[PDB]
Symmetry: C2
Subunit: 356 residues, 2 copies
Amino acid sequence: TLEAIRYSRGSLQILDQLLLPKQSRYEAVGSVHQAWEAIRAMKVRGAPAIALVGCLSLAVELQAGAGGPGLAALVAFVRDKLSFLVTARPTAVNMARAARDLADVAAREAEREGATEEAVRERVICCTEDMLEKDLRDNRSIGDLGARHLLERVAPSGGKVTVLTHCNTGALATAGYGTALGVIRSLHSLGRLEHAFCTETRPYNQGARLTAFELVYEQIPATLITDSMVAAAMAHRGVSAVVVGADRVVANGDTANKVGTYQLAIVAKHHGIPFYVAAPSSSCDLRLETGKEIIIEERPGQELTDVNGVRIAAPGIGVWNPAFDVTPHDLITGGIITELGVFAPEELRTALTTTI
Amino acid sequence: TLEAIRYSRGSLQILDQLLLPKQSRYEAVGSVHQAWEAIRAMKVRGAPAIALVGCLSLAVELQAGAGGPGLAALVAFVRDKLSFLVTARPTAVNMARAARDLADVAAREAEREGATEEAVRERVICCTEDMLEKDLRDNRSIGDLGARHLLERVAPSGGKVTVLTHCNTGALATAGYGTALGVIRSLHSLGRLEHAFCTETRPYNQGARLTAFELVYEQIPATLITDSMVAAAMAHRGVSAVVVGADRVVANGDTANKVGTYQLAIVAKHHGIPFYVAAPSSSCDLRLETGKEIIIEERPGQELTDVNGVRIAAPGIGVWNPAFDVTPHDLITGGIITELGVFAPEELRTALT
C-alpha cells in the first residue's frame, strides 16, 4: 500500500525521496530520460527500485508507441534505451541485469518465426511488468517466510516479538514491501509484533529519515533510538530479534551491509537474541568465497562531519567514513532470509543454485 | 595543555564552550554573579569545572577585599555566595559538595582562637586554589597511572597503542587534562600513542564537538568515527584498548556513563581488547552496591530528533532517549582507573572505604 513506485499500463509515478520525510509527493515519469534524470538526482532509492523505474519508463515509451517504425529499428530502440539506462547509476548490477533479460527477450522475440514490430513491443512491456510483480512477490515472500521462521525460533507457542532493525530496507529501498522491514510488516499483519525498534543509522540517517517514516505511515508501534542505544535497548526494552538487510551476501554468508550491522550482530549475540539477514538471492553474490574479498566503500569525511550543510564536528579532525561493514556469518544466528526460504549460512550457496 | 579554566590569583578566565568548536574565546570572570551566569549560560561544562569556576570566582572576589567587614560578616558572605552559586545549575552536585566543604573551611578557621578577618580571607582563597591543584594533579595521576597500566597490559614488549574513547572527558569536561582523555594525553607524551579514535556520541555530540577539538588542539593523531563504526574500527583499525569516563561508579564497579558505553564494553570484549573506566574516586559511590540501584534519566525526544534546530527524524516516530546506560563490572576487563591507580572492580570497595 505504501508505494515508492506507482505503475499502471502507460502510467508511471515515483515518490520523490528528496522531499522525504517532511513531504510525501509523487512525480510522473514520462520518459526513459526523465527516469534517468530522476535516478541520478537520487529521487529514486534502492538498486532494485532504480532498475524497476528505468525499465518501467521504457515500457511507458513503448506503450506510447515510441521506437521504430520497423522492428530492427525497435529492437535498436530498446537496446539503446537500456544501455542508456545502465549509465544512470552503475552503483549496482540490478539495472544491467534487467537490461540483459529484456534485451535478450526482445532479441529472442524478434528472432522468432513471424516476428512483427507489435509482438516485440508488447512482449518487452509484459516482461517489464513481470519484473515488477516478481520483486513485489519476492519481497512479500521474504517478509512472510522471515516472519514465520522468526516466530518459530522466538515465540513458537504464540506470543508477540519485539524486533530491532537498521538502516532502511522497506518500501523506500525496494519496489514495495521491503526486506527486513517486510518481515516487520508480516509480523505486524499477523498481529504478532509487539514493537519495532529502528536505529538512526549515522551518518546518512536512513533509519531516522526513512524507516521511521514507513513505521509511522503503517501505524506500526515503533521507537527510534540512536545507534549507540542498541545494547541498552536489547538489555532494557525487551528486544527479542534483530533483522537487517544486505548490500551483499557472499558465498559463505558473510554479509556486507550498512555500517553498524556488524556491531548489531555482536550486541545481539551478547544478549542471546537471533540475528537475521533478509535479502533476495539476486543480492547474494556467490563468486566471492569470503567477506575479505569485499572492498569497503569509504565516503568523503565531510559527509560524516557535516549535516544539512553545516559542520558539526570540530575542524581539522581526521575522519573515517566507511559506508559498510561486513558481518561474519558465525554471528548470523537466526539465518539468511530469501524469497526461497530462510537459510543457515553454510546452506546458502547450495540452496541458491539447486532450488526453485 | 588545553585550558578551559585559566586562573591566577586575582584573575579568572573561562573558555566559552558555546562558541566551540569553531572559535576559541576567553571570558573574564571578575565576580561570583558573573560565574553564576556563565554557568547558567552553559559556557562552562563538566561538573568539577563548574564547581571550580564558582569557587574560584569567590576567590577572585575575596582577593578584591570583597566580603566582610569584621570576620563573622565574611563567613556569612562566603556562605551566601556558595549557596548562591549552587542555584545556577544544580544537576551537578559537585558545586553543592564544594560549597559545604568551603563553608566548613571558613567556619572551622573562623572558630580558631586569635582569629582575624584576613586569615579567613586568605585561607578560603588558598583552599580554593588547592582544590584546583588537586583536581589537576589527580586527573594527571589517572592519565599517567592509567597509561602505564594499559601499556603493560597491551604492549609489554614496547610498541605503540591505539585507543578508542567515548563522549568528552578532557579539559572541556574537567578542570584540565581530563580522565579518559588524560590517559590518551599521557600515552602521547610517552611517545607510545599510535592513534586515538573518538566517537560522535549521539545525541549531544560531545565527541564530535569537544573531544575532536581537544585532540586536534593537542596535535594528537586522531580520527573521529560514528558510534555505529566502533566494531569495524576494532576489527580493522587496530584498536588495542578502550578507555571511557564515568558519570558514576557503584561499589561493585558497575559503571553508569554516557549512553553507548555498555555497547563499547560488549564490542571490546568481542575483539578481546581491555575496557577501562577512568574516574576520580569522588565519582565512585559506595552507597549503592550494584548497578541495579542506578536510575537512568531519560531526556526529551526532540534532543535526539533534531540537530542544530532542524528535525532529522521522520515526523511522528516514538523516541527513547536515555542519557546513560550501565556497564556491568564483568565487562570492565582493563580496570577502573582512579587517581590512586588501576583497580579490578572487586578490589574497589576496600580500596575506597
